[PDB]
């Protein structure tokens, strides 16, 4: 399945806990990436 139009499937079929953290935010009046150590969606680590 070499990524053609329609050659994809839902990752969200049997998944629960669709959360989202605040990776992007402001600190010291500066646009920043706040943390760099945060889970992806539902507690899952962000691929390394």
């Amino acid at each position: 399945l070499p990524l053609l139009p329609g050659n994809s499937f839902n990752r969200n079929v049997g998944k629960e806990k669709f959360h989202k953290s605040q990776h992007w935010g402001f600190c010291n009046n500066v646009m920043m990436l706040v943390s760099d150590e945060k889970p992806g969606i539902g507690g899952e680590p962000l691929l390394g």
């Binding site: 139009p5 050659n7 994809s8 839902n10 989202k20 990776h23 992007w24 990436l33 992806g40 962000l46």
Partner: protein
């Protein structure tokens, strides 16, 4: 030697760009880490078009992600390919647009364009010979419509002698995902007609209808629609980064499909979309790509080309194929239908051929059509705009934020002059 800088405006632009960079990372064999894991030697010849080299052999995209509310920006970063974009390329405020063209253009989108053009200048001055700019946005929102046109009008006066390609999600005829779609669409099209070099009108009705009656999916989430749009974007720029027999880049295509300066709205299409249940029933031949390219059900816009006259047509092929078959198929499809092509232009179709087909595919083709039947979109938008505007519906949200009421009337008048130009060039004769 021809770098392309990518602009992603709004949440629609952010999701479509996050799919597009995934698609061409798969095309060039770049892993989600950022390194190169590929087999051919041709995938590294032209990679500076989209990627910047770093220290350690890392290729990072030449894209900037502009938004106002970082919710979709977090959703972009929490994805599969969210770790390849540089964190300095993410630009965001702290207040929502709220589906307001005034909030996107005047009040909240005025303090952010300074940062956006700072980042855009930083990316554009690193290129050895910049080709142009690409933009992804939607005409039914607050940040894509409100600030995307501001970015267009800023970077075009900064860089006049370049090209501007827009992939714009026009309002749907029956979805109506926003109540103030006619206001936002009219006020954005009035800027696009003056400040855009090429516009591609991509519509969600046509995307859904292609995705059922041609691809035969049952549950088409937005990943599939973004994949179709991303395949169109990859097929447009393919001769720039892969060799072939007859090369044609974006400037050449714009030259050969824009005969008058106000006429730069295009219908796209993609050709080998094969059904999930019917792939042993079809053959892979150039006439079978052409028959699907020129099918009226295969356009990515909700307008019927049979209602007007094809001004110009461009076809970009991918794969190893014979030139005689391609030329005779374009000649046959021109000659057999003499009522859907303007008679004062012979040879309405440009052809380009690239050597490398997409991965897992044998042949490919992309169709870009400049047609007079695009006046139906602007006519519907103008009629809905006057139906709302005659009654002062929803006007306080726009007028109480420093917008005069003559702006609406001048936008309507420019849209009506444009559709009059389209009607005149439909009704013109050879004599």
């Amino acid at each position: 030697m021809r770098e392309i800088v990518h602009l992603q405006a709004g949440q629609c632009g952010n999701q479509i760009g996050a799919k597009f960079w995934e698609v061409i990372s798969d095309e060039h064999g770049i892993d989600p880490t950022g390194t190169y894991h590929g087999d051919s030697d041709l995938q590294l010849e032209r990679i500076n078009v989209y990627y910047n080299e770093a220290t350690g052999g890392k290729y990072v995209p030449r894209a900037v992600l502009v938004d106002l509310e970082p919710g979709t920006m977090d959703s972009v970063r929490s994805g599969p390919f969210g770790q390849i974009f540089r964190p300095d390329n993410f630009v965001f405020g702290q207040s929502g647009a709220g589906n307001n063209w005034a909030k996107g253009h005047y009040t909240e989108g005025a303090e952010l364009v300074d940062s956006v053009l700072d980042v855009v200048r930083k990316e554009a001055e690193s290129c050895d010979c910049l080709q142009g700019f690409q933009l992804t946005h939607s005409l039914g929102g607050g940040t894509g419509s409100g600030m995307g046109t501001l970015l267009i009008s800023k970077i075009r006066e900064e860089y006049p002698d370049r090209i501007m390609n827009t992939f714009s999600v026009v309002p749907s005829p029956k979805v109506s995902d926003t109540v103030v779609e006619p206001y936002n669409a009219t006020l954005s099209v009035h800027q696009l007609v003056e400040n855009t070099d090429e516009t591609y009108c991509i519509d969600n009705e046509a995307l859904y209808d292609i995705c059922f009656r041609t691809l035969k999916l049952t549950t088409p989430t937005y990943g599939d629609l973004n994949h179709l749009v991303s395949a169109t974007m990859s097929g447009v720029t393919t001769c720039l980064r892969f060799p072939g027999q007859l090369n044609a880049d974006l400037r050449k295509l714009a030259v050969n499909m824009v005969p008058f300066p106000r006429l730069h709205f295009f219908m796209p299409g993609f050709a080998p979309l094969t059904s999930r249940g019917s792939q042993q029933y079809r053959a892979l031949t150039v006439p079978e790509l052409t028959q699907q390219m020129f099918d009226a059900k295969n356009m990515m816009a909700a307008c019927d080309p049979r209602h007007g006259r094809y001004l110009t047509v461009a076809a970009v092929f991918r794969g190893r194929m014979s030139m005689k078959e391609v030329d005779e198929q374009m000649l046959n499809v021109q000659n057999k239908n003499s009522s859907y092509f303007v008679e004062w232009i012979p040879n309405n179709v440009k052809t380009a051929v690239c050597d490398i087909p997409p991965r897992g595919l044998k042949m490919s083709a992309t169709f870009i059509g400049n047609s007079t039947a695009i006046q139906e979109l602007f006519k519907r938008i103008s009629e809905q705009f006057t139906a709302m505007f005659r009654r002062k519906a929803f006007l306080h949200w726009y007028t109480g934020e420093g917008m005069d009421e003559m702006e609406f009337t001048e936008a309507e008048s420019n849209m009506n002059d444009l559709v009059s130009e389209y009607q005149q060039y439909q009704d013109a004769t050879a004599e």
